Amino acid sequence: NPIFEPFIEAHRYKVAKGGRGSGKSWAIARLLVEAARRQPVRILCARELQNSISDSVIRLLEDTIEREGYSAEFEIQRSMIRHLGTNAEFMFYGIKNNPTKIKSLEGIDICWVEEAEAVTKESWDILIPTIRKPFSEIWVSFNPKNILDDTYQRFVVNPPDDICLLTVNYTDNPHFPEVLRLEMEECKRRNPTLYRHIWLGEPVSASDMAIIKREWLEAATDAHKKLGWKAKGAVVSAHDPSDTGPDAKGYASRHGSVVKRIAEGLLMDINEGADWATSLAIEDGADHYLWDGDGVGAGLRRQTTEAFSGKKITATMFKGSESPFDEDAPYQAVRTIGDVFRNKRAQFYYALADRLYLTYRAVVHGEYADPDDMLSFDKEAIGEKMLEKLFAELTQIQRKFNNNGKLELMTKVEMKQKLGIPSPNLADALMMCMHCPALVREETEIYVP
């Protein structure tokens, strides 16, 4: 397979990146087998996680060997392949599984890291210094996930010396099989964005129109712990009722500048969702509750206020399509709020982005900022799983062009259509949390000006 010829020459790093069905795995297994037939090489096949030997490439190597008719040249055991002439040897370990064993390995000439998109930073940091024999090589094959993932950073963005980087897709595969073609064509039609990621190997990256950067979010995680301040203020919760579609319902809650809960609501109708979200608000001790009223949520006001009966909890229907709040007020932090934002959705997503950016500059560049103007994610309270789902949605929120030079964002419907992603309801819920239109004191009425 001609494109791989540079892997035959000596290079410290040989990295093959591409999408599904590119032929990169078959090529590498073939080259490694042919090398083993000729040189007494010790070859480590490594991956992030190996729960059983069947997760490794040993079966692929056996098939290659059998395919080319080399069977009689080899010894084959459960977890090892050895060439009878050269004494070359394949071995197979997971990095996360037994790091200790990997560090102890000696005389390794070639390490193949397969499915390397899964390989974490700490894994590379364990693995790479163990491959220390002079002229030893590290071969890497992976299908890019995110541009910010360590593997993509390490070999594409900030690449080491002496790297042979090949980029391959199914069109570079002369024996691209029908079973994969059908699946590829089907995917190309149903979801073009997913197709380019899976089949053309394009990593997930930030649109140049995105408004919130991932590095801000990472800095913002536990920023209150990093910078040494406590949550102070009212509790605000918000609910995104989603649609009648499959998309999960959203809930977010914060205590002042510290977000404390992010939740998804699955397999609920509209009333179940409202009941779920209002119950969370009560459990979170909310002083203020908002929900998206622009769609299916427009009828939820009665159920919502009833759920709060007897409790001093403000209840506000958020309509993101409306003119911005206080639109005639001068813009801050002759130009009015109305000149700047098309609508409430943009207004409050930018309030969120601004808080996040300010926190990022505080954490990363030591620039002082009032905690009140920042936003921290309480990782422990929220849980890593929900936090990551939220972040994956926030990094996709994007600005679109506007013919009055106003700030405007792609709607949820537009995102779903163009990006092929589920509605970003966790992100919208958090956005609505940024808004506090209802004035209240323990000693007074609730006043909505």
Ligand X SMILES: Nc1ncnc2c1ncn2[C@@H]1O[C@H](COP(=O)(O)OP(=O)(O)O)[C@@H](O)[C@H]1O
For 204, residues 6+ apart whose C-beta sits below 8 A from its C-beta are 145, 146, 147, 197
Q: Which of 183, 178, 161, 434 is nearest to 324 (CA)?
A: 434
User: Which range, of 19-27, 83-91, 121-129, 278-286, touches ligand X by CB under 6 A?
Assistant: 19-27
Let me know if 446 is exposed, middle or buried by CB neighbors in 10 A (0-12, 13-18, 19+).
middle
Residue ranges in 157-176 that form contacts with ligand X under rule CB under 6 A: 173, 175-176
Of the candidate residues 1, 120, 136, 167, the single one contacting ligand X (CB under 6 A): 1
Of the candidate residues 7, 13, 14, 24, the single one contacting ligand X (CB under 6 A): 24
**Residue 23 interacts with ligand X (CB under 6 A): yes or no:** yes
**Residue 288 interacts with ligand X (CB under 6 A): yes or no:** no
How many Cα atoms occupy the beta-carbon half-sphere of 396 within 13 Å? Answer: 25
Of the candidate residues 40, 85, 159, 177, the single one contacting ligand X (CB under 6 A): 177
Nearest 10 degrees: CA dihedral of 301, 394, 324, 307? 10
**Residue 120 interacts with ligand X (CB under 6 A): yes or no:** no
**Residue 25 interacts with ligand X (CB under 6 A): yes or no:** yes
Work out how close the CB of 15 gets to ligand X at its nearest, in angstroms, rounded to a whole number. 13
**Residue 21 interacts with ligand X (CB under 6 A): yes or no:** yes
Work out how close the CB of 177 gets to ligand X at its nearest, in angstroms, rounded to a whole number. 4
Of the candidate residues 18, 94, 241, 250, the single one contacting ligand X (CB under 6 A): 18
Q: What is the DSSP letter of 37?
A: T
**Residue 145 interacts with ligand X (CB under 6 A): yes or no:** no
Of the candidate residues 3, 11, 12, 20, the single one contacting ligand X (CB under 6 A): 20
Work out how close the CB of 34 gets to ligand X at its nearest, in angstroms, rounded to a whole number. 12
Helix (H) or strand (E) holding 26: helix 24-36
Beta carbon nearer to ligand X, 23 or 265: 23
Whether the CB-CB separation of 315 and 305 falls below 8 Å is answered with yes
Tokens linked to 389: 């789902």
Q: Which of 252, 217, 444 is nearest to 353 (CA)?
A: 217
For 134, residues 6+ apart whose C-beta sits below 8 A from its C-beta are none
- Known binding-site residue numbers for Mg(2+): 25, 114, 240, 243, 292, 428
**Residue 254 interacts with ligand X (CB under 6 A): yes or no:** no
How many Cα atoms occupy the beta-carbon half-sphere of 438 within 13 Å? Answer: 23
Q: What gap in Å lies between CA 87 and CA 75, rounded to an integer?
A: 10
Of the candidate residues 22, 123, 221, 395, the single one contacting ligand X (CB under 6 A): 22
- Known binding-site residue numbers: 21-26, 114, 143, 173, 240, 243, 292, 425, 428
Q: What gap in Å lies between CA 135 and CA 107, rounded to an integer?
A: 11
User: Which range, of 22-30, 275-283, 338-346, 419-427, touches ligand X by CB under 6 A?
Assistant: 22-30
Amino acid in the structure at residue 415: M
- Known binding-site residue numbers for Mn(2+): 240, 292, 425, 428
Work out how close the CB of 330 gets to ligand X at its nearest, in angstroms, rounded to a whole number. 57
Q: What gap in Å lies between CA 329 and CA 334, rounded to an integer?
A: 9
Contact footprint for ligand X (CB under 6 A): 1, 18, 20-26, 173, 175-177
